[PDB]
Amino acid sequence: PQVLALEVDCNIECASLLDLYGQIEVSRSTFTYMKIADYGQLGEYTCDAKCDAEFGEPGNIRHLEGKTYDYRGVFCFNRKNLQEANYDFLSFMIGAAQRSHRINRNQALMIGKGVNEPKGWLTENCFPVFQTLPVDVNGTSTPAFLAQDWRRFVTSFPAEYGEARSVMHQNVFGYLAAMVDANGRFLFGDGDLTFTPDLVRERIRISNCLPDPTEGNTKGGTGQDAFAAGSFVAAQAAWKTAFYAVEKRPMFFEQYEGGSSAWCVKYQFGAEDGGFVGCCEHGRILQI
């Protein structure tokens, strides 16, 4: 009988893989763009004293286009407890749907499957994927993932594509910082109880709803804890040209007169957005 204002909720978001992808804004729900397939060969090293030439072979210029998909839902009330309550269901619920939008959108742009959802770059599976070699232990051939791989993966990006960041679940970065060499020493941060360099300088943006290969941080791997080869660990791409996220209209909430039967006041919300993968040559995937 002494109700407080304490509102312990204890629910988490992810990070946001939105400020990486190239942003474009469109008004209509159907946009179209051109693509340069290949310039083609024009002109050979012809001989001398030859009053002639060769037409070569012209290039190719395709014309692509993509739609925008919508995202909507419904939530209603009973209008009786809404008048006697000591709290505000509306402002809690309006925040409760937009909370569902941000996490559904970012996840859909990653793992989207074809119809009525933007095809994510994971399921698209046109990013060249690199898999790592397994290791030996007591004759067993368990799969593993060493720091020698991570340096090899990041540096193998073509330099002429530009600078490229990387994305990974924080549990693998904890797996990186906690490695030990032969005798007893850590590979990174020798003797300071923690290794935490400025991520922005090593071009490593971190997230928490990626496939997370080390299952619940319980799959390091010496015996039956092998990484279960065939799992996503990290990705790396020139995101400002490898994937685009389109935006048309932010969320709206409109009362639905009709359907509200004088007991159950029913609100309606929706939004329009979308995404598509650009040239998926800038961008590679690491796996166990």
Binding site: A5, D88, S91, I94
Partner: protein
């Protein structure tokens, strides 16, 4: 100057938690304020309080207690812009509407919030009233608020408070800010306390009022309005019982067999006339007292719902409960010392008679210089 160390840190240690953007009013108060605009007497009181303050005329002027020879009218041009803005706030709204919205929110919740758009040099460009129900604010670490949160998701304009804002070389801010004028209460808690609005102590009587009016509606339609409950006997040969019914029926205004006696041969029928008082449906005696109390809690003479009571209504609840807090709140942070916002008392139509008489009698006084004879009844110099 500012010590930055107030004794209001008692509440941030446990009683509150930093950086949370708590709401300023409980939802129960918001819904209570909502239906109070629909209740007959409550809405009548709210609009009455609102219209009265909305009638007063604004102006900026020199303050009487000007011991600050270093006048805070820093530019004397910001004052002209401040004069302009007091008469013409943000487009699609005039100063009258602003005063009305401010006092209404001050009556329902005991709070006032606003927003300014000072250009770059203390020249305030526009003013906006702020919806108090859905306003959230965030406190600092020591004792007070830093910024105000307005809206759940899209609008997140953390408008900083007046205490922390980019100030000029003189002290005036340069960027936007908000006011959050608060009505004090018990146990201090300058910003961490419960609101103080008349709606706190009128909950029971408005419940009584609505309950009795509900009894009025149900008992209005539902009780038979007929008289002459006529009943026959058990030997009446149905076939003339209608004939008897037609005889008594055929006397309606005009009647045909009208205004004449009803003669029945044998078989005495018995009629009894139903009173149907129906004159105490709304419970007049236990109703006006409920009307009187929720009117008294709002500070209005019952006579208003004679001229002496109007004058009392003006100079006992209107002026020093809606005018002096709003004026002093603006005068606190809208201009420097020596100059402040003033409203002309002689703009009140009911106070003209009293101001006229006090001026006449003081004219008769002689052991008093001319300048003090002025300031005692307005008229600075």
């Amino acid at each position: 100057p500012a010590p930055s160390a107030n004794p209001a840190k008692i509440f941030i240690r446990r009683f509150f938690s930093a950086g949370v953007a708590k709401n300023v009013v409980s939802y129960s108060n918001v819904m209570a304020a909502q239906r109070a605009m629909e209740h007959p007497v409550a809405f009548r009181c709210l609009d009455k309080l609102g219209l009265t303050v909305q009638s007063v005329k604004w102006d900026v002027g020199k303050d009487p207690q000007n011991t600050q020879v270093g006048d805070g009218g820093m530019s004397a041009s910001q004052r002209k812009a401040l004069q302009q803005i007091l008469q013409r706030p943000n487009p699609t709204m005039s100063g009258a509407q602003l005063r009305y919205s401010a006092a209404l929110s001050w009556a329902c919740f005991g709070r006032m919030a606003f927003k300014v758009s000072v250009m770059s040099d203390g020249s305030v460009n526009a003013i906006w009233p702020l919806g108090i129900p859905f306003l959230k604010q965030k406190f600092d670490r020591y004792g007070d608020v830093e910024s105000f949160q307005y809206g759940d998701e899209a609008g997140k304009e953390t408008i900083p408070s007046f205490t922390k804002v980019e100030k000029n070389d003189k002290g005036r801010p340069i960027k936007n800010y908000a006011f959050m004028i608060v009505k004090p209460s018990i146990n201090g808690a300058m910003n961490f306390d419960v609101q103080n609005t008349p709606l706190q102590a009128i909950g029971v009587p408005v419940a009584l009022y609505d309950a009795l009016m509900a009894r009025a509606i149900d008992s209005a339609d539902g009780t038979p309005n007929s008289k002459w409950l006529v009943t026959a006997s058990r030997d009446l040969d149905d076939g003339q019982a209608k004939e008897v019914k037609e005889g008594i029926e055929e006397t309606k205004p005009g009647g045909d067999n009208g205004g004449e006696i009803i003669f029945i041969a044998g078989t005495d029928v018995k009629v009894q006339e139903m009173k149907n008082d129906l004159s105490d449906i709304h419970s007049k005696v236990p109703l006006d007292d409920q009307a009187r109390t929720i009117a008294g809690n709002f500070g209005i003479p019952i006579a208003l719902l004679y001229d002496e009571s109007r004058k009392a209504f003006f100079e006992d609840t209107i002026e020093p409960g809606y005018l002096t807090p709003l004026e002093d709140g603006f005068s606190m942070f809208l201009c420097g010392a020596g100059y402040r916002v003033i409203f002309d008392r002689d703009s009140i139509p009911a106070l003209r008679k009293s101001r006229a008489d006090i001026a006449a009698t003081y004219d008769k006084v002689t052991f008093i210089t001319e300048e003090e004879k002025r300031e005692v009844t307005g008229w600075p110099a």
